[PDB]
Ligand binder design. Structure first.
Ligand SMILES: Cc1nc(N)c2ccc(-c3cccc(S(=O)(=O)NC(=O)[C@@H](N)[C@@H](C)O)c3)cc2n1
Ligand SMILES: Cc1nc(N)c2ccc(-c3cccc(S(=O)(=O)NC(=O)[C@@H](N)[C@@H](C)O)c3)cc2n1
Ligand SMILES: [Zn+2]
Ligand SMILES: [Zn+2]
Lengths: 398, 409
């Protein structure tokens, strides 16, 4: 099952030829995107990240300094104003360094972990575009960690642990790791590349991760660990990535005062855990075949009446569920109850609550699921507490 | 005092010449921006809005169809790929209509209220840029409501109610209101403009809102109610706006099946309540002189020790307040208590919890505020519950406080 077909059926998003590779998130798909942002934020809270927002575009001059112009030119969208040329950012790193560069820094500030849900644009050839997997405008759950050489091992280990921690929520059984080494066009010395590739290879082995080399596929600024997930057709897609950069901070004049009073350039680790939100949503859509776990489901509960005799009770329950923080809708249409149930089932709404006269008298609800399971009559507070528990725990099934 | 000065003082954001009019949001300014998004979302929910995201760019051909190319050329950034020209969006409306246009719509689907925190770029001349108030890249708390002619009154009224509801949280109740009428360069017939302008005036009148006309200041596609807020120099900034558009939906082939199975074109109401997030933060910054309400404050509480002896205790408390959902920092430095209070007052931190030996003993904290007020010792759990309530109610004013700092009484 193809995320593009499911995305249309569940009204998640669309794309059009007036904007190739550019996603229009509809309400329900955007709800998924936002829930993923909430999840990421909760994880970055524990791991102590800042969260920032950089500018959408910056002077071409700045992208010339980083090496992006010489090593990344063809991917970049450019625009002009008042005789100055700007690049729409294809990466968030240079903006993060700009923010790091505001205010004197010392060893006391390191490791400084700086995250952003960063909108990137990369001008992918149109013949290479595919659904949500390969687009031109996407958002990374990005971060750059500024640290000392002595902190590299712990900080890279932290990124690796974050990947497996977050991925375990979604239950991925196939996670293939690649180590992508020096590409033909690059910055930094061969010596720097030797150290950076060895640091990543050793980090993988210390974490007991079998990996394969992907020769020549590293970033222009540094080698990359890539966490690869697989779509329905078993095509490989880079999702999480951890990269070691001994070059950009220097090109952008980043420095701090060390514990020993020597002013030094910080090491920068680049990482994304999900990768791009769009691609990760494509993956989840296929992985679950549109049956999103309850915490991610655009609409968690639909409550239906049999006739308008139960309209008032249905409205009351809907407000009660909604105030409990559940994404709930009332379906009060003059349609047969079996017509309503089938519609919400096909929409993959996890839970459907049916209210007939028996339910109104008892203060209960008849509960069924999108898999056709019939949970019978349940008391309203019990369904609320069960749902709240499954949402709060981000449970994989139930 | 200017929001740009306070912005530096509180490390909210900065700007550089490498990106004129593009904001770099630091952690603490982004915290305020994010909390405003949460607040607006709470209202989108209550008022029954979808929330969507349109793409940054779309073909110039589409922008030509709207009348934006003729009427809005100067302000648009363009870029190209594979011999096709794209406009970076200056508004979110055309993207919303593209979403509406997916799948057959019926009168049953109306009113359809579609919100977006919509990132816009407008190529403002560099000479007229001004801090956060006038930038090139900004985010509107935007929405378009697609409705029938019979629904206009209720839907415009709903937007007006939403403006006063949201502004009341900040203590803005006496709002200056203008009705901006047809500009010299416009689309749509005189008849359509007469109607749209009357509809907005009747809505204001029905709501007992005094207003003035502002001739020729309407959007190219429709007239605008404008809600003005003032900065420290009493300069008038457009914040909230509610607009009536009988032109764009037809230009972009929007339709729905009416009750007699006839094809109809939806009316579109545009509105932003805060305006742009950047401009609204600038306004709040100046209005409160950086004394943001606790729910918005980048750092809500600072816990400080006197000597090394209380460091262990402060850390326990910081962890405890942090698990309770409060934005809290520890200040463990070898500095005098008064030195710390002055710093965190300049940082506008609502509450400062002072921990000496006697506090370690009794499991309590000595509470001070950024307004110089000594609130005595309180129990940790008492402080937590009171902060939680101040945050959840989005209270304008602090514990035991009559009047928050605000420039306009
Ligand atoms: C053209 C195109 N289309 C997509 N759909 C894409 C989807 C995802 C990615 C992608 C996502 C995360 C990371 C990277 S990366 O280039 O390997 N790395 C970076 O960008 C780093 N600067 C970042 C992790 O700090 C790339 C890149 C894409 N590029
Ligand atoms: C150039 C520039 N710089 C800013 N800082 C700006 C800050 C805010 C605004 C602004 C905010 C809200 C609304 C409008 S508007 O042009 O009047 N109206 C619209 O854009 C409508 N399409 C929308 C409300 O649906 C404009 C426009 C700005 N333009
Ligand atoms: Zn990066
Ligand atoms: Zn609009």
């Amino acid at each position: 099952r193809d995320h593009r077909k499911i995305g249309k059926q569940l009204d998640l998003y669309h794309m059009q030829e007036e904007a190739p590779g550019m996603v229009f998130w509809h309400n329900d798909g955007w709800t998924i995107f936002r829930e993923l942002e909430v999840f990421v934020r909760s994880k970055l809270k524990e791991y102590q990240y800042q969260e920032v927002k950089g500018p959408f575009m910056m002077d071409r001059v700045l992208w010339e300094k980083t090496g992006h112009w010489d090593n990344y030119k063809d991917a970049m969208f450019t625009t002009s104003s008042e005789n100055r040329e700007y690049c729409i950012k294809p990466m968030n790193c240079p903006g993060h360094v700009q923010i790091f560069n505001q205010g004197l820094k010392s060893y006391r500030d390191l490791p400084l972990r700086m995250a952003e849900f960063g909108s990137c644009h990369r001008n992918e050839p149109s013949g290479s575009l595919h659904g949500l997997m390969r687009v031109r405008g996407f958002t990374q759950d990005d971060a750059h960690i500024f640290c000392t050489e002595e902190q590299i091992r712990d900080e890279v280990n932290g990124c690796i642990r974050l990947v497996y921690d977050m991925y375990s929520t979604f239950g991925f059984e196939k996670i293939v790791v690649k180590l992508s080494t020096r590409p033909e066009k690059r910055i930094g010395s061969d010596e720097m590349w030797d150290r950076a590739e060895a640091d990543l290879a050793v980090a993988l082995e210390e974490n007991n991760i079998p990996f394969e080399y992907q020769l020549g596929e590293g970033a222009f600024y540094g080698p990359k660990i890539e966490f690869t997930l697989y779509d329905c057709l078993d095509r490989a897609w880079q999702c999480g990535t951890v990269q070691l950069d001994f070059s950009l901070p220097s090109r952008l004049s980043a420095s701090y005062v060390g514990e020993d009073n020597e002013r030094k350039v910080p090491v920068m680790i680049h990482r994304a855990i999900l990768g791009s939100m769009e691609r990760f949503i494509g993956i989840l859509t296929e992985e679950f075949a549109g049956f999103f776990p309850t915490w991610l489901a655009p609409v968690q509960v639909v409550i239906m009446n049999i006739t308008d005799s139960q309209s008032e009770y249905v409205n009351e329950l809907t407000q009660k569920l909604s105030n409990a923080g559940i994404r709930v809708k009332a379906d009060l249409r003059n349609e047969k109850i079996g017509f309503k149930i089938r519609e919400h089932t096909l929409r993959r709404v996890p839970y459907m609550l049916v209210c007939g006269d028996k339910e109104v008298e008892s203060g209960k609800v008849a509960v069924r699921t999108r898999r056709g399971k019939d949970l019978g009559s349940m008391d309203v507070n019990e369904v609320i507490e069960k749902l709240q528990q499954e949402i709060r725990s981000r449970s994989l099934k139930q």
